[PDB]
């Protein structure tokens, strides 16, 4: 067993700020034979595979932009990123390699940025799916910060909690925002039954919610 | 350029078997230890196995979490690297990376894993593979003007993953995809994209979707209404 850890789990930092992350290894990593520290240091970007940054502890892979530097020796290690930019978004895990090879459990960088409020659009079920006896209704709400956001929907009226699946993308590595989908599914004969559905966006950018809807009749 | 890509990934039962693949190219097969790396759905990497290069013998190494139970292993004259999965539980649900591990007779080397692939994924479950329902999403209404937001609707198939395209990749800005959500052993996603109005309907706006585990191609017009 070597074990490692990071620190911390996660944290949101403003571009052009600095970002400090820890590892620690459960033994020294120091090879007194080639005076190097077996650790190194991945990005994972959303949706995408792990890229090295750092090997040696200190030694920064080609092409990785300067701004990444490690340090440490020993059981302890720490990755800096100077002036965050919103591409670097992403987890990021060190990794012992003097005993096979051990990951740490990541620390997730996310970016703060100025709030904004989400464009919100509503779809009915397509006659596709209505054919087929479902009803889907769908609400997305794209493009807003922070990451906190509520959906309600309406259904003449009335608020109806069943049947909802809700899914947040992670954060845009160009805008730093977030999005949400939320779907309402019925069966055809429940969504006949009904004429007004609203999707209701509660977001701290406003005090109103942002309301989207459609009558089944038009 | 140093290439990777892994094979053979799917849906397999609890208690059963699965042979993974690498394909290399642009280096040295023999020069390099390979490893290979999982990483479970929102969790850590773990690193499982590695192949030592042809100076050590093609040795294995293993982590305590699959020995026994899986077998890392390479063809030399191909360039591939495998990896044998016996006695498959949920845990080892998860993509499998491959990985170009060290060459340490190099003058130049360094200790890293430094080229991966696009990685390949796993589930281990006894529920049914089941295609998706792919449906349009257009507006009911809309202002007088400026941007227009479709979508699609991937409803209802196991196992994951599934990919979307918007007019085969020729639209990607202004694209958000889901994640996909599990609610009764199906899985169910969605994706929207956001063109000027000048540009819809007028010009064509498809989602492209597939679906591996049961060679599902879909293409699907959003057309006004
Ligand atoms: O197990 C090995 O062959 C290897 O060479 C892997 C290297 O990453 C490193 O762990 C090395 C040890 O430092 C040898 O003591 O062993
Ligand atoms: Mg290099
Ligand atoms: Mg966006
Ligand atoms: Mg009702
Ligand atoms: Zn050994």
């Known amino acids: 067993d070597i074990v490692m850890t990071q620190s911390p789990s996660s944290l949101a930092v403003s571009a052009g700020e600095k970002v400090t992350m820890s590892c620690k290894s459960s033994q020294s990593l120091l090879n007194s034979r080639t005076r190097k520290n077996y650790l190194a240091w991945y990005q994972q970007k959303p949706g995408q595979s792990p890229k090295l940054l750092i090997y040696?502890?200190?030694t920064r892979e080609s092409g990785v932009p300067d701004r990444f530097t490690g340090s440490g020796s020993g059981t302890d290690f720490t990755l800096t990123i100077s002036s965050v930019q919103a591409e670097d978004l992403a987890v990021y895990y060190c990794?012992?390699?003097?005993?096979?090879?051990?990951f740490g459990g990541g620390t997730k960088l996310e970016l703060k940025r100025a709030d904004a409020a989400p464009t919100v659009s509503i779809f009915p079920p397509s006659s596709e799916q209505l054919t087929s006896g479902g009803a889907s209704v769908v609400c997305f709400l794209n493009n807003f910060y922070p990451k906190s956001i509520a959906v309600k929907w309406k259904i003449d009226g009335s608020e109806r909690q069943n049947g909802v699946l809700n899914s947040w993308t992670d954060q845009d590595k160009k805008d730093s925002t977030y999005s949400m989908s939320s779907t309402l599914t019925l069966t055809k004969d429940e969504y006949e039954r009904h004429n007004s559905y609203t999707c209701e966006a509660t977001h701290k950018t406003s005090t109103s919610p942002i309301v989207k809807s459609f009558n089944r009749n038009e | 350029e140093v290439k990777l890509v892994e094979s053979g990934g799917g849906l397999v039962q609890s208690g059963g078997s699965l042979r993974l693949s690498c394909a290399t190219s642009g280096f040295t097969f023999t020069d390099y230890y390979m490893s290979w790396v999982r990483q479970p759905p929102g969790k850590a990497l773990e690193w499982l196995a590695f192949?030592?290069?042809?100076?050590?013998?093609?040795?294995?190494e293993y982590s305590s979490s699959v020995k026994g139970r899986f077998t890392i292993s390479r063809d030399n004259s191909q360039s591939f690297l495998y990896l044998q999965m016996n006695t498959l539980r949920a845990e080892d649900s998860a993509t499998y990376y491959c990985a170009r591990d060290i060459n340490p007779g190099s003058d130049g080397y360094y200790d890293a894993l430094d080229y991966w692939g696009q990685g390949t994924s796993v589930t281990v479950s006894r529920a049914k593979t089941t295609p998706p329902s792919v449906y349009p999403l257009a507006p009911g209404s809309a202002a007088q003007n400026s941007m227009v937001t479709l979508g699609c609707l991937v409803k209802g198939y196991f196992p994951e993953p599934v990919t979307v395209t918007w007019n085969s990749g020729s639209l990607s800005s202004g694209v958000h995809t889901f994640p996909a959500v599990l609610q009764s052993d199906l899985y169910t996603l969605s994706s929207s994209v956001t063109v000027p109005s000048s540009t819809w309907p007028s010009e064509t706006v498809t989602c492209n979707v597939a679906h591996p585990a049961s060679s599902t191609k879909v293409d699907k017009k959003i057309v006004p209404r």
């Open positions: 990794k012992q390699s003097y005993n096979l090879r051990t």
């Open positions: 040696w502890a200190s």
């Open positions: 192949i030592r290069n042809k100076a050590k013998g093609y040795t294995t």
